[PDB]
Design a protein around this ligand. Structure first.
Ligand SMILES: [K+]
Lengths: 41, 45, 44
């Protein structure tokens, strides 16, 4: 049953990673749009 | 069931892996485009 | 047996953490340099 705490801990840390990835994705897609609007500029 | 939770974890980890691969290739493209614009900027100066 | 899967997941999660860290750091620099290019084109 100690195993249950390690699964729980993995679930929580993974959620923080998922949230961090979502944040990066939006920042990156924004950078790409700005860059594509500097290429054409 | 613990096996169901570990399975659900493995699925979420695979999807994270896909996303990271894609974001990494996308970042590489972004840096290329950035370097190009910087080189254009310095040349224009 | 399920502990071997859990251990393997912990080792994978940390490698993914490290990947994201490289991505985040390089993106931070790119944005800094992006702003600079925008600002030296708004003044121009
Ligand atoms: K970020």
């Amino acid at each position: 049953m100690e195993v249950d705490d390690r699964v729980s801990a993995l679930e929580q840390r993974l959620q923080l990673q998922e949230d961090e990835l979502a944040v990066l994705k939006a920042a990156l897609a924004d950078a790409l749009r700005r860059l594509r609007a500097c290429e054409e500029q």
